């Protein structure tokens, strides 16, 4: 399940970081 765990964690970091617009 190493690949499956990587897909879930990658989405959280990508979605949370890109969830808000980058300002300054």
> Cα separation of 17 and 20, whole Å?
7
> Cα separation of 12 and 9, whole Å?
5
Alpha helices in the chain (DSSP H): 2-19
In the numeric block, the tokens 């399940």 are attached to 1
Structure tokens that stand for 3 in this block? 């690949």
> Cα separation of 17 and 24, whole Å?
14
Residue numbers preceding breaks in the chain (C to N > 2.5 A)? none
> Cα separation of 9 and 7, whole Å?
6
> Cα separation of 13 and 5, whole Å?
13
């Amino acid at each position: 399940f190493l690949g499956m765990l990587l897909h879930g964690v990658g989405h959280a970091i990508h979605g949370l970081i890109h969830g808000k617009q980058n300002v300054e």
